[PDB]
């Protein structure tokens, strides 16, 4: 019945499309199981949730700048003039059952999408996963991050509330028009005239629901296809070489783990959507150029840019009756940052001279200069991000606002230098900590007094020993070293049973023996594969 049906459908599919060999190649593909290789798929799942909830939102949203009088249920805004966009954003959150939940899941998913992209980028950079043959795919990811930043910005600009409209007036309108020679032409091409105009929100809506997400989808497809057919990197370890992939096959283990991780990410984003308020636009009011509120932060992934605006000094030039205003610096700065991010693999292969194929990753401690540089970059990013929140920090943490500006200004130079130096020394220090275990074995923490009164700590050797009993020094192999005896199995196991009642002793004995035999067989399999290759 259920088996004959599967065989019949399988034969029908195979006689018509003969996919057996290609499907089997997909089922046998091996992926490494490292926890940090799951960071990219948080971004993928966030993007999928964004697509689903965004499609739901487009069924109710009218992105018009046409001014109307609010006639809905939210009493504190009755009679207030607003755009159709603000109108329908309110209608979603009050007049459609589940609309507020969908809207909040969309916005939380956008935040998790940007944050996931950042953390996954950090893994790629610090482990060296960008090196050849994978330079292009770092470039594709860099473009994906830029597109995600601007997509999220356009998305939260759509409701045309006071806060987001203030963000549009300063960043999208002010910086753009400040651009030299072509600034005002770019402004009038984008807005159709002066700010705010009547075309901006419908145009941003078209960019946000179709055009930018289509480019993102195409780039994500290229990205995942490159990963799939270039065969994911791995960390050094037992049995791992430059020419193999150690891990699990797709069918069934990796497929089950991916599906379960997708379900758990969805659960977290769903709990956030209905437990934490995000962007309650009815409290902000519709956008009016005469109004503003304290605390005009953008979403976090834009804050650094805003932070840069806050920190850069009022340096302007007035050549021959023209004006180059302060915001131009910020624009140039952004370009520079992006250009340095896209170009990093080629910069590093030019500096280091290393142009070899690489499939084995580097532990971040073992590349101290790149780790120091990335730590320096993260320090600058965090300083600019917190500079953007300097007014909130001043209010909550009792710091002068002027002082926060100057702390950001000086720290923008000093903090990355300090962080670079500290991260460099810390990475080399971890290298020395690994060396110590390699020469002496694992410190067990057990102190012993010898008969003549010496105090010695017992060590657990990781390899062969002498006739004197000291271990032979082992060579570093790019892989982590154990430093706790409990992580080597010294603690044993409690004893089989439920939490409150023991199982029969014979069951416990059989289970423990089977577990030890299985662990030994797995170690032996990896060892003999390593010995053979």
């Amino acid at each position: 019945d259920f088996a004959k049906l599967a065989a019949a459908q399988g034969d029908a599919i195979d006689s018509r499309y003969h996919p057996s060999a290609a499907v089997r190649r997909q089922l046998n593909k091996v992926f490494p199981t490292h926890w940090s290789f799951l960071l990219g798929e948080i971004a993928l799942y966030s993007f999928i949730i964004l697509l689903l909830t965004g499609v739901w939102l487009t069924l109710f949203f009218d992105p018009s700048m046409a001014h109307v009088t609010y006639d809905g249920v939210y009493q504190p805004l009755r009679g207030v003039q607003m755009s159709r966009a603000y109108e329908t954003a309110l209608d979603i959150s009050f007049e459609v059952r589940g609309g507020l939940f969908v809207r909040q899941v969309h916005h939380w998913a956008a935040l998790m999408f940007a944050a996931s992209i950042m953390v996954h980028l950090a893994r790629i950079f610090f482990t060296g996963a960008f090196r050849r043959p994978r330079e292009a795919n770092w470039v594709i990811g860099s473009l994906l991050l830029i597109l995600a930043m601007f997509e999220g910005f356009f998305g939260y600009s759509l409701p045309d509330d006071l806060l987001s409209g203030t963000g549009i007036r300063a960043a999208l309108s002010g910086i753009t028009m400040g651009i030299p020679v072509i600034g005002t032409w770019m402004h009038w091409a984008l807005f159709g005239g002066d700010f705010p105009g009547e075309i901006l929100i419908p145009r941003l809506y078209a960019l946000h629901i179709l055009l930018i997400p289509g480019i993102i989808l195409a780039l994500i497809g290229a990205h995942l296809a490159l990963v799939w057919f270039q065969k994911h990197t791995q960390f050094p370890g037992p049995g791992r070489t430059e020419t193999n992939v150690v891990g699990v096959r797709v069918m069934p283990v990796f497929a089950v783990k991916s599906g379960a991780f997708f379900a758990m990410i969805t659960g977290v984003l769903g709990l956030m959507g209905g437990l934490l308020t995000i962007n309650p636009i009815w409290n902000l009011g519709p956008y009016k150029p005469s109004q503003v509120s304290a605390g005009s932060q953008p979403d976090f992934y834009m804050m650094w840019t805003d932070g840069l605006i806050r920190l850069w000094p009022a340096w302007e030039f007035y050549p021959f009756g023209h004006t180059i205003p302060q915001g131009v610096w910020v624009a140039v700065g952004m370009g520079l940052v992006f250009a340095l991010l896209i170009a990093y693999p080629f910069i590093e292969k030019k500096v280091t001279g290393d142009d070899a194929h690489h499939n084995l990753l580097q532990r971040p401690r073992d590349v101290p200069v790149r780790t120091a540089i990335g730590s320096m970059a993260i320090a600058l990013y965090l300083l600019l991000t917190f500079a953007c929140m300097n007014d909130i920090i001043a209010l909550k943490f009792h710091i002068s606002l002027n002082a926060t500006t100057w702390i950001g200004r000086i720290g923008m130079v000093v903090l990355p230098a300090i962080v670079y130096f500290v991260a460099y020394r810390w990475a080399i220090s971890l290298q020395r900590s690994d060396r110590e275990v390699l020469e002496h074995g694992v410190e067990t923490g057990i102190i012993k007094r010898l008969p003549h009164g010496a105090y010695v700590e017992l060590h657990q050797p990781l390899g062969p020993v002498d006739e004197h009993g000291h271990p032979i020094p082992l060579e570093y192999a790019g892989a982590p070293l154990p430093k706790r005896m409990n992580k080597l199995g010294s603690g044993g196991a409690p004893g089989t049973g439920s939490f409150l009642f023991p199982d029969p002793a014979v069951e416990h004995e059989a289970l423990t023996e089977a577990a030890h035999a299985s662990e030994h067989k797995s170690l032996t399999a990896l060892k003999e594969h390593q010995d053979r290759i």
Binding site: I447, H452, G453, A454, Y455, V456, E457
Partner: protein
């Protein structure tokens, strides 16, 4: 003062016999131990 400068990680590669509150002094000047017991009281 009955160990090296600086001490090792676990402070002692050996200990002397402890028979008073001046064990390092008795370690370094054995000939004085008798005097130390004889002259202790005014």
């Amino acid at each position: 003062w009955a160990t090296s400068c600086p001490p090792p990680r676990h402070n002692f590669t050996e200990l002397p016999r402890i028979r008073s509150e001046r064990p390092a002094f008795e370690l370094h000047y054995p000939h004085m131990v008798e005097r130390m017991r004889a002259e202790a009281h005014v």
